[PDB]
Amino acid sequence: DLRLHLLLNTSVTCNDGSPAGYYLKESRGSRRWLLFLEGGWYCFNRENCDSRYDTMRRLMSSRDWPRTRTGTGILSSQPEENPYWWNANMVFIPYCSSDVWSGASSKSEKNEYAFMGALIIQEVVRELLGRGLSGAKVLLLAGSSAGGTGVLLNVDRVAEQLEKLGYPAIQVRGLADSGWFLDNKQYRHPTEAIRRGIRYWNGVVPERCRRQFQEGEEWNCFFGYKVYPTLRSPVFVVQWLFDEAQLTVDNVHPVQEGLRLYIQNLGRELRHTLKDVPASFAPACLSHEIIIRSHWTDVQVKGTSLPRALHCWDRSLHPLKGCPVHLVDSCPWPHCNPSCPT
């Protein structure tokens, strides 16, 4: 079990002004640290954040959080559930800022809600240094869905934070799961949502990407294939070719020719954006998230499981014979890979 710690800096808050926090299970014999960013969509104006506060309040507030969580998947401590990093120090950071982890704006007389995702990550890192993180060899910043996009937005800032504090020896790396979206045509008539959100949240993006797209165009940096080439930290990208969230925002729900072509073109476009991503795992399945799911060990691409691919990645950061790191399916239709989640 992982134990809850509310942030000592109570100015770093969830949407409703309650303190943010993190769940921690230490492994005293390990210098590996895993910091996981939870996902769960977002909200981008007053009325839709009000709706979210009514029936999704744990994503907006710490008032009802439990004192413990069970670590699952890559956060599990048993070797049988987690062949990759079972002995690591484990941290689960709950998503209570509704801003895809980009915000830096407090609740005030002008703002009903606080959007502090980027500041929550920085404060969790600061407080953990006094609990063992100062001795780390690797800090892996991981996340699913909105948390996967959050990895892309924040991994270089964590690296810069530790360098400025005097820790040049901690290697910061990223693992982005189900956070690699496309700004494509809908099937029946995201960019506008993100454009709205950035202004409402006072959202922040990585510096080099911001310098390319410039003012008013920062929304471009929420799309993996645009922001990834600007990053300096090593990032492993896990992405279903037919992600259910992508199909949802594309307004896709006996498949006729028009829809068949749309789905096939979406898979081919996703595969194209990953061609030059050297650490990636992209199966041809219709699904959503993987890395903290209990059965994340079951799926395979070209005969290699995801825990194995991540182990091969670790070795490459010390090509490897029989231990690949770039794994992208080529078959063109959902569940053409027999190991897809049922």
Ligand X SMILES: N#CNc1nc2ccccc2[nH]1
Give the Cα separation of 233 and 317 in Å (integer).
Answer: 12
288 catalytic per annotation: yes
330 catalytic per annotation: no
Q: Does 12 bind ligand NAG (CB under 6 A)?
A: yes
Least distance (Å) between residue 254 CB and ligand X: 29
Q: Given the complex with ligand NAG, which of 119 and 124 has the nearer CB atom?
A: 119
Least distance (Å) between residue 42 CB and ligand X: 6
11 catalytic per annotation: no
For 91, the 3-state DSSP assignment is strand
- Cite the beta strand spans of the chain per DSSP E: 2-6, 21-25, 32-37, 68-69, 89-93, 138-144, 171-177, 235-238, 242-243, 280-282, 286-287, 300-301, 304-305, 326-328
Which one of ligand X, ligand NAG, none is in contact with 145 (Cβ closer than 5 to 8 A by kind)? ligand X
The angle formed by the CA atoms of residues 211, 214 and 216, to the nearest 5 degrees, is 150
Q: Residue 87: how many CB atoms within 10 A of its CB?
A: 12
Closest CA to 139 of 166, 159, 165, 161: 159
Give the Cα separation of 224 and 165 in Å (integer).
Answer: 28
Q: Does 9 bind ligand NAG (CB under 6 A)?
A: yes
Least distance (Å) between residue 105 CB and ligand NAG: 11
> Using CB under 6 A, which residues numbered 165 to 184 contact ligand X?
179, 181
- Residue showing tokens 């980009």: 102
DSSP code at position 230? G
Q: Given the complex with ligand NAG, which of 119 and 328 has the nearer CB atom?
A: 119
Least distance (Å) between residue 150 CB and ligand X: 8
- Cα distances from 128 to residues 60, 69, 81, in angstroms, run 23, 18, 26
Interface with ligand NAG by CB under 6 A: which range of 4-12, 31-39, 242-250, 293-301?
A: 4-12
Q: Does 222 bind ligand X (CB under 6 A)?
A: yes
Q: Does 165 bind ligand NAG (CB under 6 A)?
A: no
Q: Exactly one of 156, 243, 250, 329 is catalytic; name it.
A: 243
Q: Does 305 bind ligand X (CB under 6 A)?
A: no
Q: Does 119 bind ligand NAG (CB under 6 A)?
A: yes
Total number of residues shown for the chain: 342
Closest CA to 121 of 71, 174, 68: 174
Q: Exactly one of 18, 178, 250, 288 is catalytic; name it.
A: 288
Q: Does 11 bind ligand NAG (CB under 6 A)?
A: yes
Q: Would you state the structure tokens that stand for residue 342, as one six-digit string?
A: 């049922």
Cα–chain center distance at 207? 19
Query: Site for ligand X (CB under 6 A): which residue of 36, 86, 201, 223?
Result: 223
Least distance (Å) between residue 180 CB and ligand X: 8
Q: Would you state the structure tokens that stand for residue 168, as one six-digit string?
A: 């040049």
> Using CB under 6 A, which residues numbered 29 to 58 contact ligand X?
39, 41
* Interface ranges with ligand X (CB under 6 A): 39, 41, 100, 145-146, 149, 179, 181, 190, 194, 222-223, 245
Active site residues: 145, 243, 288
* Interface ranges with ligand NAG (CB under 6 A): 9, 11-12, 119
